[PDB]
Design a protein around this ligand. Sequence first.
Ligand code: NA
Length: 130
Amino acid sequence: KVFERCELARTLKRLGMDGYRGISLANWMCLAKWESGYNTRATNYNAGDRSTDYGIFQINSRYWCNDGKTPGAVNACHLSCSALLQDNIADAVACAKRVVRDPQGIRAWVAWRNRCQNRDVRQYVQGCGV
Ligand code: NA
């Protein structure tokens, strides 16, 4: 599914993401936009290290989900990577919350540092009613 901006913003609020471990809704929105363009079925194979990024938040298979084919991988969210390609984002959100529970927090995603950190991120939630 490709979410529309405000549709996603309202969905993430209801799933308890606003201020989760100190992270504002607008930052989660900036993250999803730059990772996948709000697309739940986005996958990106990383040839450099044989891992794959899955779903709306492009969660990596080396640490977070199991796809079987990534060497030396763990599965900290206790999910098949397949769960991260559903239209319903409940599992992707539960796994994203697990990612930011580590010390790096939202910095775990490099796209966030590049595209979101120290920016005016108000634009991603403006007029959405959240
Ligand atoms: Na894994």
